[PDB]
């Protein structure tokens, strides 16, 4: 019955500055990503709410993740600060031990004109805590692969998301 939070933070960088990344990778994710990378994401569907805080959306993956799915609740969005926070409320990463995972994606500017893409994962734990580096890294790599696809597209299509 011990409740705790395990926090993991990772970053990487992009030549694309925060406004363009946020508009595409975050704000237009539901339309952009299945169009760009159908094998990753088949579709995204709002179950409830209008797009703000409290919205509940289900993401159905493509073949790359066996047409599985996740359901997310939007926790916050701070468009001027390029910050998006959401919680996993259904998915394979939940378990008896892990009741919820709360995330933040924050885009920070660098003085070279680029972005730092920061990802924070907060695992809400119950009982004994057993969190494996392998599962955390697999998560990290799935995020970055997906991000890199969107980045690829934006570089190839410089008129979109201006």
Residue numbers in the entry: -1 to 160
Cite, word for word, the article reporting this structure.
Here, a series of new methods are presented based on the use of a low X-ray-background film as a crystallization support and a photoablation laser that enable the automation of major operations required for the preparation of crystals for X-ray diffraction experiments. In this approach, the controlled removal of the mother liquor before crystal mounting simplifies the cryocooling process, in many cases eliminating the use of cryoprotectant agents, while crystal-soaking experiments are performed through diffusion, precluding the need for repeated sample-recovery and transfer operations. We have previously shown that the transfer of crystals to X-ray data-collection pins can be automated through the so-called CrystalDirect approach, which relies on the use of a thin, low X-ray-background film as a crystallization support from which crystals are recovered by excising the film with a laser beam and attaching it to an X-ray data-collection pin. The CrystalDirect system enables the automation of sample mounting and cryocooling and can contribute to closing the automation gap that currently exists between crystallization and X-ray data collection.
Some of these crystals grew in conditions that require the addition of cryoprotectants when processed by standard manual methods.
